[PDB]
Amino acid sequence: REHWATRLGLILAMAGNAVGLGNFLRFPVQAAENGGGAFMIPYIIAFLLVGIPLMWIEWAMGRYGGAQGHGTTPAIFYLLWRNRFAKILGVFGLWIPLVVAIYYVYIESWTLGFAIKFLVGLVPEPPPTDPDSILRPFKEFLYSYIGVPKGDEPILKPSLFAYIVFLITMFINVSILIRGISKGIERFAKIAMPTLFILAVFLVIRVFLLETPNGTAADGLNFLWTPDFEKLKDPGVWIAAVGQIFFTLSLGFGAIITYASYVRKDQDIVLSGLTAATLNEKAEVILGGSISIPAAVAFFGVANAVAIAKAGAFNLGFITLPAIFSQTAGGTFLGFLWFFLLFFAGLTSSIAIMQPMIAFLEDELKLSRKHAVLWTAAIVFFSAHLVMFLNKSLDEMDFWAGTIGVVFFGLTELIIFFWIFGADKAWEEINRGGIIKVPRIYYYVMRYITPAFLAVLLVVWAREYIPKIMEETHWTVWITRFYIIGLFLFLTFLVFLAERRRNHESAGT
Ligand SMILES: CN[C@H]1CC[C@@H](c2ccc(Cl)c(Cl)c2)c2ccccc21
Ligand SMILES: CC(C)C[C@H](N)C(=O)O
Ligand code: NA
Ligand code: NA
């Protein structure tokens, strides 16, 4: 089996798994939509009660599986629980990251396309005061790039440049993945993560220097870091906070598991898992939190920045921020640095959610790395045409896989590992080879608090929030549902073929 070459390489690869578009795009919107500082209390609590324990659990499951030559959940769930239903539940650890990759790589491709155009100065020119007259050219720039519907039909028409850039983006992901774990993912992480850190710090400093008649960057930080204790009774803020915690730490995606399956049997995962998690949070709350929100608040004020965040998932990062930057000397180049930052952040993450499918094909169907990588990319590339051409297909995939899917799968993986496999066996497995030990209290958090926390969340989620969606959406949602259900059945069939290939080999050997 492939293994991580160095300790630092492992940490940076895992940090690259976690530190992505979620830190710089998702977090600021989620925080601003939910009261800034009011979002942060449930966010911190979710990190301590969910983020941390599940990170350790997933590293542990991965290392355990990898020792026996298995990096993905269909096999790993079965090793922990010898039941046919374990294999089927394990399919979600291939389905979730695959579906997520299908739109995530597309969003990542926009950041590359924007980086190129901003570098070359092929950007909108606003008039040389009126906020609408500045923002509109940038809105139109994004809308023409992805091809937002101009009529009634839910049809997207991406520009030719956007389509070619998606192809280049797929190629770049392949070029890293094809070289493998140590010489591909690990080697790239060692270059990408320092670059990402430096670019982000530079942007934080530049943003901190922003002052207008409407406010300062400090007003943005005060908005994000001032608690509101009245919002603690609102379940929506809690649901948002936990959803971000899962997304940002790559939990419930089978991705941490697969990466950890290349950690050697003896090698620590307690300190390594905690460091990767802590590096992500710093990149999220300190770096991601200090760019978009403070800049928007400085130029528009709090109320207008909140409205901007509520307008959509991509307004703040793809429209508002570059528009703000264009009002400063060298602002176009600053836009480039922002989008290059986003691209490297996305790239280190997208390779992480393509690796589970790669590992499955290698581990279970015995494909070569080359064939496993090329077939995974072919599936992601083909499937992304749905996200590229059908309006709100991205939304539907992100709802089922990237939102509901991960929380369900987090609860599922915990029950299988910490309840069925055995709490004391799981606790032993986590701590084995640890440089530091997991604090004793976390045994009771993992066994009782975390599963109860997630179960209550999922019940309130399903009853008081999601029936409003399943009924009040456009009929075209069924196209995406139909296709991603098909992918699940496709992956179930491959799991079937893998266990039949095992029987043929077990009969021969
Ligand atoms: C629950 N889904 C929401 C919030 C997350 C948000 C989202 C999802 C994935 C990513 Cl990568 C980002 Cl940056 C942001 C989004 C995007 C488009 C449509 C809907 C949504
Ligand atoms: C799907 C995951 C790889 C996402 C990543 N953790 C991010 O924050 O962008
Ligand atoms: Na990343
Ligand atoms: Na993240």
UniProtKB/TrEMBL annotation:
Main location (coarse class): membrane
Membrane topology of this protein: Multi-pass membrane protein
InterPro entries, sorted: Na/ntran_symport, SNS_sf
Listed transmembrane segments: 8-25, 37-57, 88-107, 160-179, 191-209, 237-262, 283-308, 336-361, 373-393, 399-421, 441-463, 475-498
PROSITE patterns: NA_NEUROTRAN_SYMP_3 (PS50267)
GO biological process, one term: sodium ion transmembrane transport
Annotated positions binding phosphocholine 1: R84
Keywords (A to Z) from UniProt: Membrane, Transmembrane, Transmembrane helix, Transport
Family annotation (Pfam families): SNF
Entry keyword annotation includes Endoplasmic reticulum: no
Binding site for phosphocholine 2: R84
Subcellular location: Membrane
One cellular component term from this protein's GO annotations in UniProt: plasma membrane
Tagged with keyword Transmembrane helix: yes
Protein name: Na(+):neurotransmitter symporter (Snf family)
Protein source organism: Aquifex aeolicus (strain VF5)
